[PDB]
Symmetry: none
């Protein structure tokens, strides 16, 4: 399903966003 693929992408982008936030903060902290 397309609906399901878009939901899985959304979730994966959220996990990337938060991981990048962890890197950003570790380098600056």
């Amino acid at each position: 399903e397309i609906a399901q693929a878009l939901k899985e992408i959304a979730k994966a982008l959220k996990e990337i966003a938060y991981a990048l936030k962890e890197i950003a903060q570790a380098l600056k902290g």
Copy 2:
């Protein structure tokens, strides 16, 4: 369900927005 996928997407995009704001602040400071 499409309804459920769109609700989960909505939530993921809001969480992404927040994470990118936190990154922006870490890289400026």
Copy 3:
């Protein structure tokens, strides 16, 4: 439509993530 709009908003979010990743990486630039 609902599908079209969801895909467009995801596309845009992915572009903003791409940019943030690029700017983080710039830490290692020489």
Copy 4:
């Protein structure tokens, strides 16, 4: 090394997603 490589892999994966979503958009047109 390890961060650089992870971010390059993510960059490439997001490009692959971007292209797939272009293909979906056009297929539904």
Copy 5:
């Protein structure tokens, strides 16, 4: 055809992301 291939490309991209987030996790630990 077109949709099948797009979903296969997304599947593969999400696997690459999954692994890259594990690499980030390990690099920050």
Copy 6:
């Protein structure tokens, strides 16, 4: 290895930019 990662990232963002242009046009 770092130099090459940054080059590949740069290129991925150009490819992304193009894909989003094609999405925008397809949704017309």
